Structure formats: C-alpha cells, structure tokens
Structure 1
Amino acid sequence: PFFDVQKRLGLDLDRWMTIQSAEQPHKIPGRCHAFEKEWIECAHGIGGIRAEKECKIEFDDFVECLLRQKTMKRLSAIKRQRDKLIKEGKYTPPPHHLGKEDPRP
C-alpha cells in the first residue's frame, strides 16, 4: 500500500505542500496559520483515534476559521433583527453607519 520511501530516504518530495503552515515563500502566512499550528501540535504523536477524541476543540476552531459558518450565522441574525427593527421604526442607524462619520487614517 503506502511504501514510505520519503521517510526512509529523507527526500521531502511532496511534504512541503501538505499543510498551510509549512515554509511558505516570502513567509506569507496562511489565513488560518495559528489554528492549524495549534491543532497539529495537539494531535502529533498521539494516533488517529486519540487525536479525534481529544483534540476536538482545536479542530473545531480550525474549521470555524476555515469556513466561518458560525460567524456568518451570527452576522445574519444581527442583520435580520436590525432590518426588522428598522421596518417597525424603533431603530435608527448612527452617522457612522450612514457615511457621515469622520474617517481616520
């Protein structure tokens, strides 16, 4: 099946592209560098089953960074409630959200 020639010879044929946080050119960081680093360090040398059971918090944070489903849900809820209130007329946006603010450098 998997004949690990690379680890036997220390060649690094294709291991540099496997993860986001592995020696990017000009040290350009990935969007989720910190979360991936945390999860990788949590799950190293632990085994698949134990990594799945024990490092679930880090993987959940990593997936949240990748897809941001919960952030989208929260923003959508806030926007919908604001729209409902502005339809009923009990809420008025501040000048900052109307373009009348004073911008800063």
Structure 2
Amino acid sequence: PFLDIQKKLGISLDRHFMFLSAEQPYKNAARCHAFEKEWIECAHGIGGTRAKKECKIEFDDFEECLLRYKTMRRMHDIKKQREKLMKEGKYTPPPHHSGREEPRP
C-alpha cells in the first residue's frame, strides 16, 4: 500500500483476505492451499524481481493447480485418442468405465 497506516498502527483491516491460503470460515481451505503456501513462503524475503526467477517452479505448480490448463490438455488428448481408436474399431470400453460396475462402498 502507498502509505502503510495498517503496518504502522499494527491493525489488519484488509491484509488477512489477500490470497486463497488465508484463514477461511470453519477451516475450509481453498483450492491449491498447499501450492499457494509454497509459492508465498518461497517468495518471502527475496524481492519480487528475484522471486520472478527463483520461485518459478512453485508459481508454475500453483497456476497449474488453480487453472489446470495442462490437465485439460491431457484429458482432451486421451479422449481424442479413445474416440479415434473406437471409430477404427480397436478398443472397447471396459465394464467399469461403461456403465455397469461393482460399486464400492
């Protein structure tokens, strides 16, 4: 913040709900709690300029957890190949994936 009134006075008007890893009602952690925590603890201390290069792995994991682009790519590719193989006639959907399974408790 431009003027650090809150840090100066020791109060926390709005600094406690900045990210997904902050305290949630009834201790229900948000999606990607672990990833965000890792990224932020990695990036503490070192400046932003250094973090942008030295916490990149953590940030990449975090964005993957939150948006999930690569997961969508992977599932799309798997189901695309499934469709191609099925149209060719070289694959069958197993019983458990088809609709009849031995349902587990």
Give the match's secondary structure for 1:31. coil
Partner of 2:88: 88
Kindly state the Cα deviation for residue 100 of structure 1 after the two structures are TM-superposed.
Answer: 1.3
Kindly state the Cα deviation for residue 54 of structure 1 after the two structures are TM-superposed.
Answer: 0.4
Kindly state the Cα deviation for residue 4 of structure 1 after the two structures are TM-superposed.
Answer: 0.7
Matches for 1:16-95 after TM superposition, within 5 Å: 16-95=16-95
What are the ranges of 5 or more consecutive residues in structure 2 without an aligned counterpart? none
Q: Distance in 1 between matches of 2:42 and 2:65?
A: 17
Kindly state the Cα deviation for residue 20 of structure 1 after the two structures are TM-superposed.
Answer: 1.1
Partner of 1:15: 15
Q: Distance in 2 between matches of 1:66 and 1:78?
A: 21
TM, length-normalised to structure 1: 0.97
What are the ranges of 5 or more consecutive residues in structure 1 without an aligned counterpart? none
TM, length-normalised to structure 2: 0.97
Kindly state the Cα deviation for residue 98 of structure 1 after the two structures are TM-superposed.
Answer: 1.1
Give the match's secondary structure for 1:45. coil
Kindly state the Cα deviation for residue 21 of structure 1 after the two structures are TM-superposed.
Answer: 1.3
Counterpart amino acid of residue 81 in structure 2: Q
Give the match's secondary structure for 2:20. coil
Kindly state the Cα deviation for residue 16 of structure 1 after the two structures are TM-superposed.
Answer: 1.1
Q: Distance in 1 between matches of 2:22 and 2:91?
A: 48
Identity of aligned residues (%): 73
Give the match's secondary structure for 1:104. coil
Q: Distance in 1 between matches of 2:85 and 2:35?
A: 37
Q: CA RMSD in A?
A: 0.9
Q: Distance in 2 between matches of 1:90 and 1:23?
A: 51
